[PDB]
Every structure is written in structure tokens, then in C-alpha cells.
Design a protein around this ligand. Structure first.
Ligand SMILES: [Cl-]
Ligand SMILES: [Cl-]
Ligand SMILES: [Cl-]
Length: 129
């Protein structure tokens, strides 16, 4: 599924991401924009052989099992395919664990390089929240 911008904002808010760990909703929407282009089915292979999955490009190196990342962990205790569902619950639940791990949203390289320090409000502007 390719979410609309306000559509994703609404789902992220209902799942309690708005201000989770102090990060306002626009930060999460901006991160999804540049991690996945709002596409739940996005996958991208990392240099180390791990793969990033889903709307928030969650990495098999630490957070999910894909059976092809030898030596990795599965800290969210889910198959990485669950992070590709049309329903974002799995991805949100796992993102909450990631952003609590100590480094905040810096875990998302696209957020650090393209959202952090910008007017992230713009990503929710005009949405009925
Ligand atoms: Cl915001
Ligand atoms: Cl594996
Ligand atoms: Cl933080």
C-alpha cells in the first residue's frame, strides 16, 4: 500500500506515534516519506547484507527476522515480512522500540539527513488531525 500523506499521519497518530519519545507527528511522517515514499512494500538491501523493510525501513540486522541476515538479531520478535503489511501496526510497534533504544530518531538515516532540523510540521500541514 502507498499511503497518502495525511492518511499516514492519521494512522501513525492513532497508533500513538505523535510525540512518542518527544518526536512530533511530522517527524514520523517526514521519516516515512524519505525512507519509503509512504510505500508499505518498500525493501532495500544494505551494504552489510541486511535488508530494510516497510514504511519505516526497519533493518533486519537488529529488529526483524528475514532468515537471510546471518548473525543478525530480531529485537521486535517478528518476521520482516510483517513490516510490509498494509496495516502499519507491526511497523509502529517496532519503531517505538527502535526510537527508545538510546539514539532517538537518528536511527533513521533519512530522518537525520533530510528531516532533522527542518520544518517537519509541513508534513502534517493541512491534515485534519
Ligand atoms: Cl509536527
Ligand atoms: Cl537471519
Ligand atoms: Cl531523543
Amino acid at each position: 500500500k502507498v499511503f497518502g500523506r495525511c492518511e499516514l499521519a492519521a494512522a501513525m497518530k492513532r497508533h500513538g506515534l505523535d510525540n512518542y519519545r518527544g518526536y512530533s507527528l511530522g517527524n514520523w511522517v517526514c521519516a516515512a516519506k524519505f525512507e519509503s515514499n509512504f510505500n508499505t512494500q518498500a525493501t532495500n538491501r544494505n551494504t552489510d547484507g541486511s535488508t530494510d523493510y516497510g514504511i519505516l525501513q526497519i533493518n533486519s540486522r537488529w529488529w526483524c527476522n528475514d532468515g537471510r541476515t546471518p548473525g543478525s538479531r530480531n529485537l521486535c520478535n517478528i518476521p520482516c515480512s510483517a513490516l510490509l503489511s498494509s496495516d502499519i501496526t507491526a511497523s509502529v510497534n517496532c519503531a517505538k522500540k527502535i526510537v527508545s533504544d538510546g539514539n532517538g530518531m537518528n536511527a533513521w538515516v533519512a530522518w537525520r539527513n533530510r528531516c532533522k532540523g527542518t520544518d517537519v510540521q509541513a508534513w502534517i500541514r493541512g491534515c485534519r488531525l
